[PDB]
Enzyme design. Structure first.
Site, PDB file in Angstrom:
ATOM      1  N   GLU A  11       8.532  30.004 -61.650  1.00 14.01           N
ATOM      2  CA  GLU A  11       8.925  31.014 -62.617  1.00 14.01           C
ATOM      3  C   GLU A  11       8.280  32.371 -62.329  1.00 14.01           C
ATOM      4  O   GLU A  11       8.809  33.387 -62.778  1.00 14.01           O
ATOM      5  CB  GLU A  11       8.474  30.580 -64.015  1.00 14.01           C
ATOM      6  CG  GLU A  11       9.093  29.278 -64.524  1.00 14.01           C
ATOM      7  CD  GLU A  11      10.542  29.396 -64.958  1.00 14.01           C
ATOM      8  OE1 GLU A  11      11.137  28.369 -65.354  1.00 14.01           O
ATOM      9  OE2 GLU A  11      11.128  30.503 -64.943  1.00 14.01           O
ATOM     10  N   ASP A  20      15.972  37.744 -65.222  1.00 13.81           N
ATOM     11  CA  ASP A  20      15.886  36.609 -64.323  1.00 13.81           C
ATOM     12  C   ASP A  20      17.096  36.581 -63.375  1.00 13.81           C
ATOM     13  O   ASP A  20      17.931  37.499 -63.368  1.00 13.81           O
ATOM     14  CB  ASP A  20      15.643  35.295 -65.101  1.00 13.81           C
ATOM     15  CG  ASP A  20      16.886  34.767 -65.846  1.00 13.81           C
ATOM     16  OD1 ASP A  20      16.772  33.727 -66.544  1.00 13.81           O
ATOM     17  OD2 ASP A  20      17.982  35.334 -65.729  1.00 13.81           O
ATOM     18  N   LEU A  32      12.237  32.729 -71.766  1.00 13.20           N
ATOM     19  CA  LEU A  32      13.513  33.391 -71.991  1.00 13.20           C
ATOM     20  C   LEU A  32      13.490  34.024 -73.357  1.00 13.20           C
ATOM     21  O   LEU A  32      13.188  33.347 -74.354  1.00 13.20           O
ATOM     22  CB  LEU A  32      14.632  32.351 -71.935  1.00 13.20           C
ATOM     23  CG  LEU A  32      16.057  32.845 -72.187  1.00 13.20           C
ATOM     24  CD1 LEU A  32      16.476  33.743 -71.073  1.00 13.20           C
ATOM     25  CD2 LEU A  32      16.979  31.609 -72.284  1.00 13.20           C
ATOM     26  N   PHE A 104      11.302  21.954 -69.315  1.00 13.33           N
ATOM     27  CA  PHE A 104      10.910  23.333 -69.588  1.00 13.33           C
ATOM     28  C   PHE A 104      12.047  24.290 -69.250  1.00 13.33           C
ATOM     29  O   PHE A 104      12.334  25.210 -70.025  1.00 13.33           O
ATOM     30  CB  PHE A 104       9.682  23.650 -68.754  1.00 13.33           C
ATOM     31  CG  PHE A 104       9.147  25.047 -68.904  1.00 13.33           C
ATOM     32  CD1 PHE A 104       9.718  26.098 -68.195  1.00 13.33           C
ATOM     33  CD2 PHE A 104       8.002  25.275 -69.664  1.00 13.33           C
ATOM     34  CE1 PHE A 104       9.164  27.392 -68.257  1.00 13.33           C
ATOM     35  CE2 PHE A 104       7.440  26.541 -69.746  1.00 13.33           C
ATOM     36  CZ  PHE A 104       8.023  27.595 -69.048  1.00 13.33           C
ATOM     37  N   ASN A 132      22.870  14.679 -57.103  1.00 14.78           N
ATOM     38  CA  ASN A 132      23.500  14.975 -58.397  1.00 14.78           C
ATOM     39  C   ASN A 132      22.938  16.239 -59.071  1.00 14.78           C
ATOM     40  O   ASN A 132      23.684  17.057 -59.604  1.00 14.78           O
ATOM     41  CB  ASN A 132      23.458  13.755 -59.320  1.00 14.78           C
ATOM     42  CG  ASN A 132      24.558  12.757 -59.006  1.00 14.78           C
ATOM     43  OD1 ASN A 132      24.636  12.237 -57.895  1.00 14.78           O
ATOM     44  ND2 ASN A 132      25.410  12.493 -59.985  1.00 14.78           N
TER      45      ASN A 132
END
EC number: 3.2.1.17
Length: 162
Positions: A11, A20, A32, A104, A132
């Site tokens: 991050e 971002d 955020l 998170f 996946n």
């Protein structure tokens, strides 16, 4: 390494509001603020999150307070959730960190909704789980933030964070 160090790598740490990879206003370590394009709406959300007037900038101590709250919410979120808790309990130490990181980033309901990946993880089908996850909007909309988590689920080592 620990979950805080891992998420710091994915991050980054920025003390001023920034956009971002998806264009969304963020601050601190991946906190955020809003999906609104209005910078002033991000500033108002920041003032709500802290409880005082910040004008779009916070201290490292305040960043770390938000970060530690966000990690705590992810950990408590996993461990009270009927889908996520058995998966977490089944995983090795390294993949447990990858699970917290994913929650998170995506939230509890986001991760709990990927029921295929959860079954794959529970069954030790690591390659299948990573393939996946690489199909997800989470990864494809922002590969750099997700790629190390995916690699970590595959390998079960800390190599992607070295």
């Amino acid at each position: 390494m620990n979950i805080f160090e891992m998420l710091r790598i994915d991050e980054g740490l920025r003390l001023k509001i920034y956009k971002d990879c998806e264009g969304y206003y963020t601050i601190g370590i991946g906190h955020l603020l809003t999906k609104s394009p209005d910078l002033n709406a991000a500033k108002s959300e920041l003032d709500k999150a802290i409880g005082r007037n910040c004008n779009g900038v916070i201290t490292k101590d305040e960043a770390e307070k938000l970060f530690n709250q966000d990690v705590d919410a992810a950990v408590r979120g996993i461990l009270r959730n009927a889908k996520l808790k058995p998966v977490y309990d089944s995983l090795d130490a390294v993949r447990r960190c990858a699970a917290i990181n994913e929650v998170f980033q995506m939230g509890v309901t986001g991760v709990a909704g990927f029921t295929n990946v959860l079954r794959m993880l529970q069954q030790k089908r690591w390659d299948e789980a990573a393939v996946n996850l690489a199909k997800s909007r989470w990864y494809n909309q922002c590969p750099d933030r997700a790629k190390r988590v995916i690699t970590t689920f595959r390998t079960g080592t800390w190599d992607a964070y070295k």
